[PDB]
């Protein structure tokens, strides 16, 4: 698994307006932190947002050692009025 | 997958008299180079020796990026007269 693969998967499934993916394992591609801002989270509680992120990363999750979902936000939470 | 896991699988299955397992992925545990010396290799050509190593690492192989079998030797090859 690579950061580009994690990025492309999230981008494909969640169409985020803001996305950050960081390999925190020293370039090993085995631990990632993600920040995902998507309109698809609107009206969804945290558990469902995580389910959506996990489902997007279904193949990656099989291999990697850690996935830290730092932010799963609507655009309005990301940038308040 | 860890270095110790690869070592343990090879040790348990091949009963070797010399074993070296080296992470060649900079500590990531995703690429290994192995030297294995075992009585089980006696009478066996190279392909069969490789299949024995792969079968010893049946689970590790599904996950890792490289396995370089540097040496698959009999005791007599390891210590020539």
């Amino acid at each position: 698994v690579t950061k580009e693969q994690v990025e492309a998967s999230l981008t494909s499934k969640l169409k985020p307006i803001h996305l950050e993916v960081i390999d925190i394992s020293g370039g090993c591609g085995s631990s990632f932190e993600v920040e995902v801002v998507s309109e698809q989270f609107e009206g969804k509680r945290l558990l469902e947002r995580h389910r959506m992120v996990n489902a997007a990363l279904e193949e990656e999750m099989k291999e990697i050692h850690a996935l830290s979902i730092k932010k799963a936000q609507t655009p309005q939470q990301w940038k308040p009025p």
Side-chain angles (χ1 to χ4, degrees), chain A residues 21-46:
Chain A
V21 176
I22 308 295
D23 181 345
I24 59 165
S25 64
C28 289
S30 61
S31 299
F32 298 94
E33 286 189 21
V34 303
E35 289 186 358
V36 188
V37 178
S38 169
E39 288 178 33
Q40 290 177 31
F41 291 151
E42 183 78 24
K44 314 286 177 54
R45 294 265 213 257
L46 182 61

Side-chain angles (χ1 to χ4, degrees), chain A residues 8-71:
Chain A
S9 282
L10 291 170
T11 299
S12 183
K13 283 279 170 293
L14 305 171
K15 187 57 163 40
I17 183 71
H18 173 67
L19 177 60
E20 206 192 12
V21 176
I22 308 295
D23 181 345
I24 59 165
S25 64
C28 289
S30 61
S31 299
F32 298 94
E33 286 189 21
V34 303
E35 289 186 358
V36 188
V37 178
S38 169
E39 288 178 33
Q40 290 177 31
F41 291 151
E42 183 78 24
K44 314 286 177 54
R45 294 265 213 257
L46 182 61
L47 197 92
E48 172 69 353
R49 297 180 191 200
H50 282 199
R51 183 203 66 77
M52 298 168 63
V53 170
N54 292 341
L57 292 177
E58 68 152 335
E59 297 284 350
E60 293 85 351
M61 293 285 281
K62 302 178 172 176
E63 280 188 43
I64 67 176
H65 304 177
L67 175 77
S68 163
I69 304 172
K70 293 308 283 256
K71 289 182 173 63

